[PDB]
């Protein structure tokens with residue numbers, strides 16, 4: 395009975411699930427767009443188009459605080475009763491972690507929040523100052539970490555607790571919360587935070603926040619890679635064990651000299667789509683909860699024997715920003731790489747026989763690019779179409795292109811697709827039915843992020859070589875060159891490198907939403923007309939008219955109120971100590 399209640403306390407951790415295509419943390423960034431006509435599904439549209447409001451929103455807050463309540467209730471049921479002292483202590487530590495985590499999941503969306511330290515309206519807490527919240531949550535995580543095991547329904551570990559504290563302190567040190575908050579006059583009305591009066595957010599840069607984040611990110615990384623038994627996924631032969639062909643990559647043929655590159659492509663596909671039982675020791679916190687794959691599949695996949703088609707929805711549509719910020723094979727940005735095609739020629743055909751639709755921008759790229767992206771003329775998957783890779787025809791309205799007559803008008807907005815998280819063994823059958831190979835946990839925390847977090851902290855503190863040394867394990871694993879001091883220039887700073895490595899490595903893992911926000915760069919990356927793609931919403935285009943830089947045509951905008959999630963109007967009314975977020 396007790397375990398059942400305990401298990402139920404974990405029920406809210408799938409809130410804001412990474413990679414779920416209708417979720418606003420996933421489908422509102424510059425990573426990829428969804429068809430405008432899909433805006434009637436879910437909340438992504440409201441958030442991307444700034445129509446979310448106090449009366450139109452994802453009331454995430456209702457869920458987190460409900461499960462926080464369950465945690466405290468469990469602790470009470472325990473006190474009134476079963477299990478050893480040691481086991482009861484573990485249960486209490488799991489609840490402590492969960493309460494802290496639920497506050498963090500709320501904080502990262504809403505900003506300053508009520509701290510609920512236990513289960514009349516005048517006694518209601520309003521928001522506490524952001525820095526108060528950070529301190530309280532961090533302490534709670536440290537306390538739970540003392541008790542929890544470093545390694546083991548994925549139950550809490552000290553490793554996870556320290557990883558959450560690391561990300562929390564990284565966020566707290568970031569511009570939004572450490573000197574660049576765009577509403578300096580926003581404060582409480584008649585609620586006070588101990589030590590902060592009515593203030594809600596710091597308006598002054600504090601270097602010590604970066605020193606504290608570095609210490610936490612370092613401690614999390616060491617714990618994960620020692621007692622936590624974590625290491626970067628580096629198996630490069632699983633494709634062979636599953637009897638799969640090496641993938642087709644334009645410009646990198648399957649020849650002896652290119653075997654390492656092609657194996658790195660498959661390693662990256664498996665890195666984010668495998669279980670610990672399959673040899674993956676990189677995941678720190680993963681959930682059983684799955685997310686939809688059909689939204690990223692191409693339209694027509696395979697014609698069945700009865701004459702109907704296996705079909706995807708083809709809606710997850712990577713931007714030109716994504717296709718321009720994954721690296722070249724030399725580990726540089728395409729625009730900055732002196733050996734790469736000049737941008738004036740990016741949209742020309744690469745001239746590959748039988749695959750003339752492949753443009754030059756898509757040749758000469760890093761293994762992560764071919765692992766996770768897909769494009770006109772290229773392959774999608776490995777066993778996808780009854781045992782063979784699927785060749786994409788993004789300009790053919792009778793295969794993978796835009797077609798206004800298709801039910802629901804599913805299509806790629808940009809002319810590109812992603813295959814990240816797609817199991818290489820995924821296969822659709824002529825006789826009907828299909829397989830997606832072996833499911834994998836949805837990643838909340840994995841070890842690559844801890845390296846990137848340490849790099850960002852070093853960069854902020856001016857420790858250039860140390861930042862480089864934290865990035866290079868991730869770069870090497872992905873099969874691009876290591877960084878050296880010679881690579882750090884006015885044109886491409888250590889911070890530029892850290893932010894871009896994060897963009898690439900953690901692409902579509904629910905980070906970009908938060909990172910652009912904490913960097914206070916909403917206008918720069920999420921603003922009107924920033925999102926671009928090919929000319930992909932014209933039926934049956936020529937190669938020439940298809941491959942033109944085209945602004946994504948939907949009401950995307952950035953205004954500063956969008957840094958924070960608005961509070962449900964009823965919560966603002968129900969709680970007299972509660973203030974609405976700025977601009978809402």
Ligand SMILES: [Ca+2]
Nearest residue numbers: 667817832833
């Ligand atoms: Ca798998």
